[PDB]
Amino acid sequence: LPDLKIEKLDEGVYVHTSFEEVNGWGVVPKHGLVVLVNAEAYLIDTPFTAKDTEKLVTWFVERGYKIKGSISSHFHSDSTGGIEWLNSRSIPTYASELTNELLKKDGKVQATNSFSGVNYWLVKNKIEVFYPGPGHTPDNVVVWLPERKILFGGCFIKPYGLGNLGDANIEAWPKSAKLLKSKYGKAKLVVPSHSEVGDASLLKLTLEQAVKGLNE
Ligand SMILES: O=C(O)/C(=N\C(=O)[C@@H](CS)CCc1ccccc1)c1ccc(Cn2cnnn2)s1
Ligand SMILES: [Zn+2]
Numbered sequence: 749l750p751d752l753k754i755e756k757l758d759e760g761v762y763v764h765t766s767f768e769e770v771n772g773w774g775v776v777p778k779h780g781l782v783v784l785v786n787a788e789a790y791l792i793d794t795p796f797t798a799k800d801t802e803k804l805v806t807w808f809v810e811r812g813y814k815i816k817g818s819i820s821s822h823f824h825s826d827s828t829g830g831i832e833w834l835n836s837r838s839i840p841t842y843a844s845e846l847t848n849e850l851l852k853k854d855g856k857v858q859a860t861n862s863f864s865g866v867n868y869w870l871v872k873n874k875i876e877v878f879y880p881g882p883g884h885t886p887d888n889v890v891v892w893l894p895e896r897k898i899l900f901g902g903c904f905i906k907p908y909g910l911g912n913l914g915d916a917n918i919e920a921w922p923k924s925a926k927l928l929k930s931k932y933g934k935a936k937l938v939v940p941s942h943s944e945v946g947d948a949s950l951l952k953l954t955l956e957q958a959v960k961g962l963n964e
């Protein structure tokens with residue numbers, strides 16, 4: 749329904765939000781971020797379509813920022829929908845080796861650059877990628893911004909419900925959420941993909957929801 753919106757969240761950090769009607773769920777927002785590092789912009793999750801990705805990129809370009817790259821938190825289209833367009837514009841794209849393999853298995857275009865491991869610095873000491881383990885999907889990773897203490901949790905952060913479990917790993921999620929909460933209790937802001945920004949308590953709520961889902 750509403751168009752893509754881009755609003756400031758904190759210094760050098762913007763939240764981009766698109767909306768989608770999802771069968772069985774109603775209107776659902778999709779939040780991603782744009783992080784600025786000295787005159788350059790990094791996309792944390794791409795929008796869902798090539799046209800929303802062009803819009804997002806153009807909004808920062810028109811303000812003098814060069815798009816240095818994008819990182820997708822997991823393989824579903826709401827995080828990677830923009831990789832094809834970014835690659836066509838020769839803008840560096842990034843995703844974990846697991847994410848690219850899922851994209852490949854899925855007949856989707858892959859990120860141009862990959863990484864693996866528990867932690868990976870997209871930008872040394874400024875934009876870190878952390879893999880807590882399987883949860884919402886097998887490959888989901890989060891993005892941490894040290895200065896502002898902002899954690900982009902993506903589709904892993906599910907404080908009020910787990911959402912679509914089609915590619916989830918219900919067995920592993922609680923372990924994954926425990927590790928994530930231990931790691932980022934220091935977060936001032938946690939930005940979920942599908943719900944409002946919150947504080948570190950969202951890590952606890954996600955652990956609870958995951959625990960709850962393993963039972964039933
Ligand atoms: O599981 C999910 O993360 C998500 N579903 C999807 O399949 C999503 C990819 S992860 C595709 C739909 C989509 C695409 C663009 C923008 C918003 C939603 C959600 C469905 C409904 C949600 C709301 N909420 C979560 N737990 N209870 N309800 S989140
Ligand atoms: Zn997903």
Ligand SMILES: [Zn+2]
Pocket residue numbers: 824826903941942
């Ligand atoms: Zn999602």
